[PDB]
Amino acid sequence: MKQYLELMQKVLDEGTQKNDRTGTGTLSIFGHQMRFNLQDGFPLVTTKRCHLRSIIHELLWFLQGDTNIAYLHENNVTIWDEWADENGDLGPVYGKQWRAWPTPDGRHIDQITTVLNQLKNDPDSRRIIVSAWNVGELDKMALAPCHAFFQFYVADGKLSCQLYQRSCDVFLGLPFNIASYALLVHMMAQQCDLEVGDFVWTGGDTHLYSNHMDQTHLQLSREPRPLPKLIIKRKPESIFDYRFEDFEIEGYDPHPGIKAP
Amino acid sequence: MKQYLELMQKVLDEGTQKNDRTGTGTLSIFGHQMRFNLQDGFPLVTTKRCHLRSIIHELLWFLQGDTNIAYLHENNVTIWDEWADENGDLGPVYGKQWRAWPTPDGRHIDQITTVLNQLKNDPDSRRIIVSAWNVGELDKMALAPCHAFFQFYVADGKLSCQLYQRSCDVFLGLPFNIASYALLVHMMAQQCDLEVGDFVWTGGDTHLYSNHMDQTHLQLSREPRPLPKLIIKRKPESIFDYRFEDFEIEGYDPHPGIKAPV
Numbered sequence: 448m449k450q451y452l453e454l455m456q457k458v459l460d461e462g463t464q465k466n467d468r469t470g471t472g473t474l475s476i477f478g479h480q481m482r483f484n485l486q487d488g489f490p491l492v493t494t495k496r497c498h499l500r501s502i503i504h505e506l507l508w509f510l511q512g513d514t515n516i517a518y519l520h521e522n523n524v525t526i527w528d529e530w531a532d533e534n535g536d537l538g539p540v541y542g543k544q545w546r547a548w549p550t551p552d553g554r555h556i557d558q559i560t561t562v563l564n565q566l567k568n569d570p571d572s573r574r575i576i577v578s579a580w581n582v583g584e585l586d587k588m589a590l591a592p593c594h595a596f597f598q599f600y601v602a603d604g605k606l607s608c609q610l611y612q613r614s615c616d617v618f619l620g621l622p623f624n625i626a627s628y629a630l631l632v633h634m635m636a637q638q639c640d641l642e643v644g645d646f647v648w649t650g651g652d653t654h655l656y657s658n659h660m661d662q663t664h665l666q667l668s669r670e671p672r673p674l675p676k677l678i679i680k681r682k683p684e685s686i687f688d689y690r691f692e693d694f695e696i697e698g699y700d701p702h703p704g705i706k707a708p
Numbered sequence: 709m710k711q712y713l714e715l716m717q718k719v720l721d722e723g724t725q726k727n728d729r730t731g732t733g734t735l736s737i738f739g740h741q742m743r744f745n746l747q748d749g750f751p752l753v754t755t756k757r758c759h760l761r762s763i764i765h766e767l768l769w770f771l772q773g774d775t776n777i778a779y780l781h782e783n784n785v786t787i788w789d790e791w792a793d794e795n796g797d798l799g800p801v802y803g804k805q806w807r808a809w810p811t812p813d814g815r816h817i818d819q820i821t822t823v824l825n826q827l828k829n830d831p832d833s834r835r836i837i838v839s840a841w842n843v844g845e846l847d848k849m850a851l852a853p854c855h856a857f858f859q860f861y862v863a864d865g866k867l868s869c870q871l872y873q874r875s876c877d878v879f880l881g882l883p884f885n886i887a888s889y890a891l892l893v894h895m896m897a898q899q900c901d902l903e904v905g906d907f908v909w910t911g912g913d914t915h916l917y918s919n920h921m922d923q924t925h926l927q928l929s930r931e932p933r934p935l936p937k938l939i940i941k942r943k944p945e946s947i948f949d950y951r952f953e954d955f956e957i958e959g960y961d962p963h964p965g966i967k968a969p970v
């Protein structure tokens with residue numbers, strides 16, 4: 448996508464060499480922002496074929512508050528396999544904080560239900576937020592949240608969302624993360640009778656791993672294609688009732704998938 | 709400052725006319741990002757006189773974990789007065805979350821100390837973060853955090869920081885918030901023997917209140933002066949041991965103050 452390819456080029460040109468916790472290098476930058484007007488098309492990278500199937504199952508899994516990979520396993524989505532313990536558990540990662548953030552008195556807070564009620568009853572609210580950054584639960588997680596904090600906003604009947612991503616793997620994670628939040632905006636907009644607005648992406652530590660450099664060079668030699676259009680085929684009773692078969696992507700004409708280690 | 713006036717101009721050119729929680733109208737945009745290279749000078753707005761005195765006292769108060777206005781009130785800082793209850797309490801706002809976020813199992817996490825240690829021992833960490841957004845306690849607070857989430861980054865011996873401000877009062881709040889975090893970057897850099905890098909400001913709901921519009925256009929008719937300079941005169945034993953008198957600003961020559969209604 449244009450913005451996505453300018454970000455890759457900027458990391459290559461301006462990133463500083465760093466050594467992560469695995470001893471693998473990265474070129475990284477700090478602080479970046481991109482804006483996707485969702486009325487211009489669904490923001491699925493076209494410079495490499497992305498597989499929406501895994502993006503869709505992961506988001507649905509998030510919304511159910513499940514942190515066990517079984518459901519992902521049942522549908523052949525393997526992106527979380529390496530973090531899962533012997534029982535397939537991840538600890539209280541994304542989903543559990545979105546649906547049941549634990550409070551000290553033993554209660555739980557459902558941020559998604561709060562957000563839907565804020566969108567329907569107080570759309571101008573300046574605090575329509577979901578945070579996965581539960582400081583007191585970080586040590587229990589297989590991984591601290593990367594896409595960690597998001598906010599919704601309503602103007603002229605359009606629903607926008609901004610994500611603060613504290614850590615971004617530009618080649619492998621980003622394409623997935625942008626599509627995931629664009630997807631969520633379409634679903635929330637539908638449940639709230641709103642049109643779609645902008646998806647604003649903000650990055651903190653934004654990096655390209657050293658073993659993604661051939662792939663990055665290959666991807667940057669390709670020209671982006673017009674964005675596809677997302678179709679929701681059925682409007683469920685609630686934001687927790689979507690199914691994989693409800694989504695269709697039309698006009699998606701990507702360059703070939705690019706594998707990365 | 710150039711970045712600040714450009715943001716004012718962006719809110720005026722693109723903003724959507726809305727109504728704040730109290731009705732008082734707002735002009736707002738959603739999503740914005742700007743950067744201040746702290747070696748260029750301390751980012752204290754020059755197009756209106758700002759008092760750094762209040763900004764300094766508030767930051768030392770945050771760093772102590774204090775949520776009562778007594779300290780501020782004693783030092784003639786009244787910016788939090790309208791939110792305090794009859795005993796001066798604000799609930800577990802900013803400072804409490806920064807220094808003692810309560811976990812489900814009964815522990816408390818001191819996020820400032822955690823960040824200080826991560827900067828000294830693992831400066832390339834990608835999770836050098838402080839969050840004031842404690843979902844479980846937001847409704848006990850007198851106000852939910854505006855400057856809600858921030859992250860540190862280290863490159864070429866310089867310390868940078870990015871703030872996610874979910875709600876921004878551009879005219880009244882912003883000048884204070886920018887100087888506040890820039891001061892905090894200086895203090896942390898001093899404690900870990902680093903140089904200052906950039907302060908990255910990101911906005912969520914970024915608005916100008918309708919009764920700040922003439923003050924905003926008055927400010928927009930002025931030219932930004934050269935940035936002042938920050939001189940810290942001592943190196944305390946910890947990030948929690950700074951004193952008001954340890955900070956001096958030099959070369960601050962602003963245009964005249966502009967009062968406005970909160």
Ligand SMILES: O=C(O)CC[C@H](NC(=O)c1ccc(S(=O)(=O)N2CCC[C@@H]2C(=O)O)cc1)C(=O)O
Pocket residue numbers: 498501502524525526527590592593594616619620621623624705706707
């Ligand atoms: O689509 C598929 O089935 C997977 C194909 C493969 N994707 C990835 O490895 C991939 C995709 C997303 C991610 S992620 O950043 O959203 N993410 C989810 C798993 C943990 C990880 C994180 O935060 O570190 C991490 C890795 C790719 O080449 O895109």
Ligand SMILES: O=C(O)CC[C@H](NC(=O)c1ccc(S(=O)(=O)N2CCC[C@@H]2C(=O)O)cc1)C(=O)O
Pocket residue numbers: 758759762785786787788791851853854877880881882884885966967968970
């Ligand atoms: O010096 C003084 O007493 C303040 C005078 C005045 N400043 C402001 O009103 C001002 C300063 C800071 C803020 S703030 O956004 O940082 N903030 C701190 C008080 C509660 C408020 C909030 O979260 O809503 C909000 C307003 C100014 O002209 O800068």
